[PDB]
Design a protein around this ligand. Structure first.
Ligand SMILES: Cc1cc2nc3c(=O)[nH]c(=O)nc-3n(C[C@H](O)[C@H](O)[C@H](O)COP(=O)(O)OP(=O)(O)OC[C@H]3O[C@@H](n4cnc5c(N)ncnc54)[C@H](O)[C@@H]3O)c2cc1C
Ligand SMILES: Nc1nc2c(c(=O)[nH]1)N[C@H]1C(S)=C(S)[C@@H](COP(=O)(O)O)O[C@H]1N2
Ligand SMILES: Cc1nc(-c2ccc(OCC(C)C)c(C#N)c2)sc1C(=O)O
Ligand code: MOS
Ligand code: MOS
Ligand code: FES
Ligand code: FES
Lengths: 1290, 98, 49, 49
């Protein structure tokens, strides 16, 4: 016992004191110093902790390789298992592996925080299949999330493992040689001989007992009934980490062969309760391929479920038994097992029974009919009898890896060769606090016939038997209930098809009897080639990959927490408010102090400077007297380890006295709770405008917020020096300047005493433009008070609850227009939920108003905005910065004008489009207005017109599935709306060896700023990029810098760098002249010798900026970035799910500095857009407490979420004279283009409604953002969504 | 190293900028702030670095002038902030060659 | 006989041959290029404080 | 040296010549390797530059 022995990257590890509560992720990072594996959620949803596990399987007598999430893997399950991390397959210090090389060169890595886990997911695949199919290559990443790339590049690059200029050359890719893959640990292979012995581990609070035989398992359970079993820990791991649970004694049966046995008997196939889903999946698939269709009906059912069950990492460790016994109300398997009466063999020392699963198995919430000394031994999924058909459906928010809203298992058995029901079972998940069977409804059908009437009765039955009270947990009452009837309808239609033999059904119906299908992907990228005669050394204009791609693809790239820890470094865990608004009447730390390693509890009282922080001094560093939102920081605990601070922080007792809370925009308006006074831009004559307008439309629209979900959450390391109040901080932020002065204000020391350094961020998107100071300042206080360096990285849920997100908008519009579709008047009043703090909320509203016009000329217009002061975490900036909201509202009422007029949308839009020279509503000339060219080119290459026909034909031939097609344009104002922020500095040193070191005020987060800056300096200085290097961003090299935001960082820092290079070239001239034939090195040295300085600054101030809302005059932007997108979708009017078929984008980036970075920026922003408009949605309780706090409940776009055909194009011949090297900001502009998916869906919803609902060609139904499957399904009204007062009114 | 170079340099900048020494600070020496430096030797470090600091202070005073003029009665803090707002760089190098 | 004898702390970063050194010296420039010559990496990769 | 030490910070002790001038005919580290905590012995051979 006691000794835990495993291997990591070939090297043998012998841990003599394994603690049962230790995960592999923590071990690899803390104990083994291998920071390649990252932490992104800890719930198993992102895959940033993916590692490969190899072991010798007995039963197959072979070495197996599988992926697994290190964050959920207890190390005590790894005895004699060989772990493989990212750093274990290659590196820049030796040689990258084909996987790491391709993803890097393919531009499949931006901030690169997700890159390691994705490299391992693709690695495991290749390690199992050296020649995968395009389909297996995709299914490999269902447990992996990327927030930067838009996924397209990751998939195109790896597509080369399968089976005009271009962004990469696959011919230069090194071929994969398996004969060179690290061999299985020889020692580890000799141990396979020795008979497994029972091990035992003792951690701080838990005891782990690894059983080796069934007999021992049964004995253990007898002696310790309360002891929990753990196999995959993908359930227990969540309960301990998130549910604050303590299972003091654990038993792992994983080794026991009988719990891993697979048997093919006459009744069906049997699996041991420890078999991993991936195994069950493998077995079943082979069973389906070999046995007749009629015997595999239930098998195919399980397969459809396992199909959208987590990802590869979870299915490789999750046990069949584990799923059943956990008894989750939303289990995807139990429903199927119950509808088929799957045989369950339960045992205990002495006893042994076998009972079929049925409704009685799940007595109450999360409980089953097992004895406290019983353990599930095996499961026998049944073969399928004649005249017996099965089906299994599941529907969530996102198709790939997600918790089901409603899931089911459906089975029917008829009398021999008849259509008469003998047995009928309908079992659902997501309708109760346990899996249930609609027995009442199914009884009334026994002996009845499979017909239109049965369909009618059942739906009525289900609708009554599975009703949900308004206060239903999880809400979505209507959608959930509709899904049970719709699911049955599909079952009903499918059975008819199946009762049709073959060796029938309506022509427009079979489509509703078909399982999900992935069509083959097709992506094209086209940008412009560089001038035929340009130096091969002038990289500007070429698709140069991100200078750090390789190191990110190898785990060598360093992120804040990756930075080693000091021997005396302490950890900080924030203690936050659990009430939306209340008084703090008392804080008790008696419990905390008792936790091992507890150092101290920090609160407002400890701050030496002022507790007044935030961009407008309306926030606190630490809450004092009252809390004003759930998650509001009250204090923090410091301890010797993360675990200890976390536990200690969890028992700090805060006693509140609630106060009247204002949660929604409504109450904000109701109670008149705002920040500042109304904003406004008015032009023309409204009264006069509507008065001349043929038609007038009024409405109200809503757009949900959004969580940044950068893979690397907020993080800060504070190092107190000891002298003069000096402190050095390593922070994941886009605003070093504010971090610097805020930290100084809190401490009360001059700003010159504080140093902030930013290597790189694993994602920012604005979530880190200012809200990062919430963590920085807290860590700084702990450093200050303790004297030791302190650090803190927020957990996903803390990040989601505290950091704030995108602003939710509420608009009340009214637009007048002519029959032709010409807008004559407009009036939109915007309201944004600002949070318990001003922060950036105000400038965001302005950017919104500057974009309520999108690309259209509106003679008479008026827009206003208010900031709703609510008791929610203060919202902040988010890629788009208010622009996306305004553009959305603009395109909503525009879409309505088209419907109302009865005219094609492109036509309505095009005629309303601005024209070269026009003035915006804020009076600014649109010079170099290229939307027209983008519009024409997009329409043409997308084949819009030819495809619109295609779309309608489909809609005609299809009854339960429709297709939408929409084409949207956009224009983004480039520049900070605050004039004084449009400045940038740069410091450049040339060392005596000729090597250059550049430093600018800009920070890197995956956008490729440092790459672009190197390219600029290399062109500027006329030397290879190899001689240039950018190490980081720091407050002592370039002071008073504006945050890396507004998409101008390239525009302004590149100009600052450029200037510096010039000073350098000027100083070096005298020497280049004296020695024309000399090298760069010669001149530099000559200049050093002649005592000429090789160090200068660079600076830039953007000219002619300064708009006034007072006089609606003055430039607000330096210029505009334009772009057009055309998307096509297909919805399933019966479930709410949909698939993006194809999108076509044409962006005007001007003369691109790097077409690989720009395009990756276009595809990336675009996907975060479709995410905002159709997938991402946050939920809060009425009292202001967020529900969605992890990837499991907050679904951002997955690999399988991008348009099947993703085509991007950068407009040719259109240099932008306003910015460095004729380029244009490409950061935010494209994000709104994801709206084309939204309006494409709406287009499909119309087709649906015209099918079973109204008959009004010009009906205007409200569809808010995000257009989730709930909103989509509910808008597809039919006999389902559709199907007793004493007296009436009449 | 104990000779008092940083003290002397603060004194020079304080006279140069005409502000109390309290508002000035020297934290350390690093190859990324001032490259290709000669060793701190030959007893000239005060002579030469002080001249380099001095020069820097001048560039600063020159950049801040327009603001001192626009607001004679203002404080050092007022002018600096005014210069930041007007997007005027508050960072410069200094150099000296004997 | 300076009271503090010679002393150096080297911190390898892990990327691009980057290294940060905390040294008791009066010649950061030579420390910088000598360290670089020994490692064989551009001088811009080495930081001396 | 007053600067705090990293949790994984290692220590180096120079191995010097005891002869005023001579040939190095052999270097043996068998004894060193036996000392608790020994990580490695560096010599001219290890220098990358
Ligand atoms: C990212 C992520 C995505 C997921 N997606 C889905 C999904 O799409 N559909 C779905 O249904 N679930 C999903 N889950 C839930 C998950 O798959 C299950 O709870 C897992 O199957 C359980 O197996 P396990 O081996 O990990 O279990 P464990 O964590 O060990 O937990 C099992 C529980 O069952 C008990 N138990 C286990 N084995 C036995 C046995 N042989 N005899 C008696 N009692 C036993 C344990 O005591 C414990 O209470 C997901 C989890 C993560 C982390
Ligand atoms: N991969 C990645 N791309 C990104 C971000 C990010 O955090 N990661 N930030 C976005 C936001 S919100 C902005 S404002 C711009 C900023 O680009 P820039 O730094 O070149 O100006 O990049 C965009 N692209
Ligand atoms: C992205 C974006 N950020 C903006 C902004 C506006 C005011 C600010 O600080 C105000 C304080 C100093 C009074 C900061 C910061 N830091 C940033 S404007 C803008 C845009 O896009 O227009
Ligand atoms: O949204 Mo980006 O400006 S921070
Ligand atoms: O002797 Mo001093 O120049 S180093
Ligand atoms: S951190 Fe393990 S899946 Fe995200
Ligand atoms: S590059 Fe994938 S999450 Fe940033």
């Amino acid at each position: 016992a006691d000794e835990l022995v495993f291997f990591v990257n070939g090297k043998k590890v012998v841990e003599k004191n394994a603690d049962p509560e230790t995960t592999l992720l923590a071990y690899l990072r803390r104990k083994l110093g291998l920071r390649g594996t990252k932490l992104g959620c800890g719930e198993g949803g992102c895959g940033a902790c993916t590692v490969m596990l190899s072991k010798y399987d007995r039963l197959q007598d072979k070495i197996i390789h599988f992926s697994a999430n290190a964050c959920l893997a207890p190390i005590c399950t790894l005895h004699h298992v060989a772990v493989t991390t990212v750093e274990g397959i290659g590196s820049t210090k030796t040689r990258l592996h084909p996987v790491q090389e391709r993803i890097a060169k393919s531009h499949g890595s931006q901030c690169g925080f997700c890159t390691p886990g994705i490299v391992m997911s693709m690695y495991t695949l290749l390690r199992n299949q050296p020649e995968p199919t395009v389909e297996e290559i995709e299914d490999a990443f269902q447990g992996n999330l990327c927030r930067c790339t838009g996924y397209r590049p990751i998939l195109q690059g790896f597509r080369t493992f399968a089976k005009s200029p271009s962004l990469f050359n696959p011919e230069e890719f090194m071929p994969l040689d398996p004969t060179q893959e690290p061999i299985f640990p020889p020692e580890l292979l000799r141990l396979k001989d020795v008979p497994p012995k029972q091990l035992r581990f003792e951690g701080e609070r838990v005891t782990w007992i690894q059983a080796s035989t069934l007999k021992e398992l049964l004995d253990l359970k007898a002696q310790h009934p309360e002891a929990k079993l753990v196999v995959g820990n993908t359930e227990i791991g969540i309960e301990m980490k998130f549910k604050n649970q303590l299972f003091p004694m654990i038993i792992c049966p994983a080794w026991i062969p009988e719990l891993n046995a697979v048997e093919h008997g006459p009744e069906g196939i049997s699996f041991g309760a420890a078999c991993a889903l991936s195994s069950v999946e493998k077995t079943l698939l082979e069973a389906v391929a070999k046995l007749p269709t009629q015997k595999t009906e239930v098998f195919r059912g399980v397969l459809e479920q396992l199909r959208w069950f987590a990802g590869k990492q979870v299915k490789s460790v999750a046990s069949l038994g584990g799923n059943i016994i956990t008894a989750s109300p939303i289990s995807d398997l139990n429903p199927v097992f119950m509808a088929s009466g799957t045989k369950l063999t339960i045992v205990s020392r002495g006893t042994r029974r076998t009972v079929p699963m049925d409704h009685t198995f799940f007595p109450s919430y999360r409980k089953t009919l097992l004895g406290p000394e019983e353990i599930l031994l095996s499961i026998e999924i049944p073969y399928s009898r004649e005249d017996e058909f099965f089906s299994a459906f599941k529907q969530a928010s996102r198709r790939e890896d997600d918790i089901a809203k409603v899931t089911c298992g459906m089975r029917v058995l008829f009398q021999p060769g008849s259509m008469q029901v003998k047995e009928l079972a309908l079992c659902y998940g997501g309708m109760a606090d346990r899996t249930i069977s609609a027995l009442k409804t199914t009884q009334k059908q026994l002996s009845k016939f499979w017909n239109e009437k049965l369909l009618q009765d059942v739906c009525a039955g289900l609708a009554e038997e599975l009703s949900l009270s308004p206060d239903a947990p999880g809400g979505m009452i209507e959608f959930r209930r509709t899904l049970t009837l719709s699911f049955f309808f599909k079952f009903y239609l499918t059975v008819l098809k199946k009762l049709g033999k073959d060796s029938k059904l309506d022509p427009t119906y079979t489509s509703a009897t078909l399982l999900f299908q992935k069509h083959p992907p097709a992506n094209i990228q086209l940008f412009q080639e560089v001038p035929n005669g340009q130096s091969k050394e002038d990289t500007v204009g070429r698709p140069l990959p991100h200078l750090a791609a390789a190191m990110q693809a190898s785990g060598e790239a360093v992120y804040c927490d990756d930075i080693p820890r000091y021997e005396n470094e302490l950890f900080l865990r924030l203690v936050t408010s659990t009430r939306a608004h209340a008084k703090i009447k008392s804080i008790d730390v008696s419990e905390a102090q008792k936790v091992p390693g507890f150092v101290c509890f920090l609160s407002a009282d400890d701050i030496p400077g002022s507790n007044e922080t935030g961009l407008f001094n309306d926030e606190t560093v630490f809450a004092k007297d009252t809390v004003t939102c759930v998650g509001h920081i009250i204090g923090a605990v410091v301890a010797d380890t993360p675990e200890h601070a976390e536990r200690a922080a969890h028992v700090v007792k805060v006693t509140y006295e609630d106060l009247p809370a204002i949660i929604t925009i409504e109450d904000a308006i109701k109670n008149n709770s705002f920040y500042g006074s109304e904003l406004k831009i008015e032009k023309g004559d409204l009264k006069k405008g509507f008065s001349e307008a043929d038609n007038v439309v009024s409405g109200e629209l809503y757009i949900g917020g959004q969580d940044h979900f950068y893979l690397e959450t907020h993080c800060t390391i504070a190092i107190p020096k000891g002298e003069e109040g000096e402190m050095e901080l390593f922070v994941s932020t886009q605003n070093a300047m504010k971090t610097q002065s805020f930290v100084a204000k809190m401490l009360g020391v001059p700003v010159n005493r504080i140093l902030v350094r930013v290597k790189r961020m694993g994602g920012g998107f604005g979530g880190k433009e200012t809200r990062s100071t919430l963590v920085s300042v807290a860590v700084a206080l702990a450093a200050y008070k303790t004297g030791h360096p302190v650090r803190c990285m927020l957990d996903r849920n803390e990040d989601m609850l505290i950091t704030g997100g995108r602003h939710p908008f509420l608009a009340r519009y009214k637009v007048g227009f002519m029959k032709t579709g010409t807008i004559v008047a407009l009036e939109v009043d915007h309201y944004s939920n600002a949070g318990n703090s001003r922060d950036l909320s105000h400038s965001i509203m302005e950017r919104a108003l500057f974009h309520m016009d999108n690309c259209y000329k509106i003679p008479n217009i008026r827009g206003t905005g208010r900031l709703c002061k609510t008791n929610l975490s203060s919202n902040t900036a988010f890629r788009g910065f208010g622009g996306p909201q305004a553009l959305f509202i603009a395109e909503n009422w525009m879409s309505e004008v088209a419907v109302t007029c009865g005219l094609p949308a492109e036509e309505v839009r095009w005629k309303n489009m601005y024209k070269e020279g026009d003035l915006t509503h804020f009076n600014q000339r649109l010079e170099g207005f290229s939307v027209p060219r983008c519009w024409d080119e997009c329409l043409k290459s997308s084949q819009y017109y030819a495809r619109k026909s295609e779309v309608d034909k489909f809609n005609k031939e299809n009854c339960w599935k429709k297709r939408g097609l929409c084409i949207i344009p956009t224009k983004f104002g480039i520049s900070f709306t605050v004039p004084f922020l449009n400045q940038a500095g740069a410091l450049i040193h040339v060392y005596t060896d000729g090597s250059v070191l550049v430093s600018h005020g800009g920070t890197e987060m995956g956008q490729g700023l440092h790459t672009k800056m190197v390219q600029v300096a290399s062109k500027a200085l006329k030397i290879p990029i190899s001689k240039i290097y950018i190490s980081e961003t720091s407050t002592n090299t370039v002071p008073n810098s504006s945050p890396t935001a507004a998409s101008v960082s390239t525009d302004i820092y590149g100009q600052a760098v450029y200037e510096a290079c010039q000073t350098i070239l000027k100083r070096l001239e005298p020497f280049k002249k004296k020695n024309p034939d000399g090298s760069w090195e010669d001149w530099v040295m000559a200049a050093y010798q002649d005592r000429v300085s090789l160090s200068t600054t660079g600076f830039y101030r953007t000219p002619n900026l300064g708009y006034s809302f007072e006089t609606n005059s003055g430039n607000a932007f330096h210029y505009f970035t334009y772009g057009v997108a055309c998307s096509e979708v297909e919805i399933d009017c019966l479930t709410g799910d949909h698939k993006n078929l194809r999108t076509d984008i044409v962006m005007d980036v001007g003369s691109s500095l790097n077409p690989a970075i720009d395009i990756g920026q276009v595809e990336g922003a675009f996907v975060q857009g479709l995410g905002l408009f159709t997938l991402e949605e946050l939920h809060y309780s009425p009292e202001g407490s967020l529900h969605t706090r992890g990837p499991s409940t907050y679904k951002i776009p997955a690999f399988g979420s991008i348009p099947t055909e993703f085509r991007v194009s950068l407009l040719r011949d259109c240099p932008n004279k306003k910015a460095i090297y004729a380029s244009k900001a490409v950061g935010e502009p494209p994000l709104f283009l994801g709206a084309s998916v939204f309006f494409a869906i709406k287009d499909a919803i119309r087709a649906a409604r015209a099918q079973h609902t109204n008959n009004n060609t010009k009906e205007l139904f409200r569809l808010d953002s995000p257009a989730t499957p709930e909103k989509i399904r509910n808008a597809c009204v039919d006999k389902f969504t559709t199907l007793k007062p004493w007296s009436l009114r009449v």
